[PDB]
């Protein structure tokens, strides 16, 4: 009746996980293990309607987190464990070789190893996740599935994916642009079509995934035709600064100027284990970074009018920041008055903390907040490919 | 009538003109090139026929200037006598030089100290100054520097900062400085005239295309953002994929990325060959499509600087002034913005002719031939009066 999938998303400092029924999206477990390789290493999870938290021990990382999942969390619930039909892994880079999700075998693992040069920070983490998954769940060893953040973007034509350099760069070396957060962009695209009550294959939108890293895509007739992760150029390359190492007063200021003050994606985004792009010395330094970010965000959105062929249906906001940071949406859209955008303050405040909705003034260009669910898409793909 | 010798000295070439600063009249123009090579040569136009001569094997800046003085002007002592000033194109003036300046010892040092930002240009400019001081000793106190970066110094920090730790700016001055600012300046002044409105109220996006162009956002007559140098249509170690990624996402040249992280550079250049480098129709089309796609994206990106109002897009430069299909193909992508090109107007506005190329009733798009040499003559005359 149900097809439960264990979903693993390993990064350089954390591991986000869930158990999800791929048939209807029911969540049986979700959580976040974070502050890896530090004294503060910890794990937060939600199960049977209740939130829980434990220390993983000083210096713990992925192996330890998975151990705690199997021997503490799932040890209480062997019945849950028994239901698992597959494991889905979120993988940053699949290049041109893997343009859709795929069952993991030794050559897929080799493909991931060979892609170390793309988001290198998270590369070891993905592999450790696969290695530990195979060990901890020997019964599912032929039913691990890789789901690639580049895959959705494989529809980009060459005018979009080529660098502004000699064609030989691509012809001889295969150097090329690829795209980030593809599973999220994919998810919000399918959802936008429902919210706008139209066929996905007629959908022209611009999608802004603002989370761990920030990317913007141009969707024409339901397919990605251009994308950039230039909002956070160093994401996946450079550690950045742990939020908890910054003066708490600076961080409170950042969170409040973002528009995240009340009046899973959210737990991650406000975490003192989240890494940020600069070691802000002052409140002013933090605000500057935010203003630069909103300026660049507005430019990306404007730039993708060049992909819309005369029709733009909506701009979509998603991810830890996009779903919750009302001021990022206000300030970025507020720079695009010439395109007929106008943010409705009350609508914008309401579309936070997991609530979806339109944030435009009715009668002006649609702007929409759609909480992403990368874990569900990974579950659906993992279940579909192992059935 | 106030004649100025205008020089733009590069590592392997020297562009020159004599311009009446009062009315824009041109008395001489030319280009010396293939320096440090067997084929070093000079082409010029005067009275008003086109000529060319070899400068001699290995010749460079000193020979080029010697030729101007002793061959081109030897027959025109009255032209030589009417020279009132010399204006020099300087690629990088950093944050210090926000307008044109009479060259003295401190300006020389300014140019030197900031060579790191433009290591292949600023040094050649200095040779040009040194050689001009020799070749035109009567004008020794009347040399003026005009900076390609000056017009761009009105950019606020939200535009000029890269998406990098703030220490890179604070400690090392890593920042957008802009390119072709003398051209963006010029077409901004002219656009206000074509649109019949004050320059202080002008919101436009200016596209200097040609010679590694750039696109700027002008709000209330001032530059508020500008692009990196575009690639012209001829287009133990960190993985190169990361370098290109950083280049593309930051908007920083491959060289400035590596940096922040006897011309060999011209030994196989075009001016060396009689025949041409082959380019297939398919490869030419691909290059065109990539260029026009990226150009349209820049234009759309700068709607985010316009604060609700975009008066016009402006095209200029050797490509922008002349390439009808670049304008049609790039604007063709921006229907959302209300752009639509009229083919016949588009074809009319070429080869030195200005005009509107938009369809009547659509967002204005204008071709304005740039005149950087006039701006340089104007500044040089004004500042030395």
Residue numbers in the entry:
A (entry chain B): 2 to 264, 277 to 400
B (entry chain A): 3 to 237, 245 to 270, 277 to 400
Extract from the study:
Acetate kinase catalyzes reversible transfer of a γ-phosphate from ATP to acetate in the presence of a divalent metal ion. In the present study, we report the biochemical characterization and structures of S. typhimurium AckA (StAckA, NCBI accession: NP_461279.1, residues: 400, molecular mass: 43.3 kDa) in two crystal forms at 2.70 Å (apo, Form-I) and 1.90 Å (citrate-bound, Form-II) resolutions. StAckA protomer consists of two domains with characteristic βββαβαβα topology of ASKHA superfamily of proteins. A cleft between the two domains forms the active site pocket of StAckA.
Another crystal form of StAckA (Form-II) was obtained in the presence of citrate. Although the overall polypeptide fold in these two forms is similar, residues 230–300 (variable segment) were in significantly different conformations in the two subunits of Form-II dimer and these conformations in turn were different from that observed for this segment in Form-I. Residues 277–287 of B-subunit are close to the active site cleft present between the domains and occupy the space where ligands are expected to bind. B-subunit of Form-II represents the most closed state while A-subunit represents a conformation between those of Form-I and B-subunit of Form-II (data not shown). As the residues of the variable segment are also involved in the formation of active site pocket, Form-II structure is not suitable for binding nucleotides and therefore may represent an inhibited state of the enzyme. Examination of the difference electron density map of Form-II StAckA showed significant uninterpreted density located at the dimeric interface that was distinct from that of the polypeptide chain. Citrate, a component of the crystallization condition, was found to best fit the density and could be refined with reasonable B-factors (33.9 Å2) and occupancy (0.75). Interestingly, only one citrate binds at the dimeric interface resulting in an asymmetric dimer. It interacts with atoms (distance cutoff: ≤5.0 Å) of residues Arg178, Asp227, Thr228, Ser229, Met230, Asp257, Thr258, Leu259, Gly260, Arg309, Lys312 and Tyr313 of the A-subunit and Arg309, Lys312 and Tyr313 of the B-subunit.
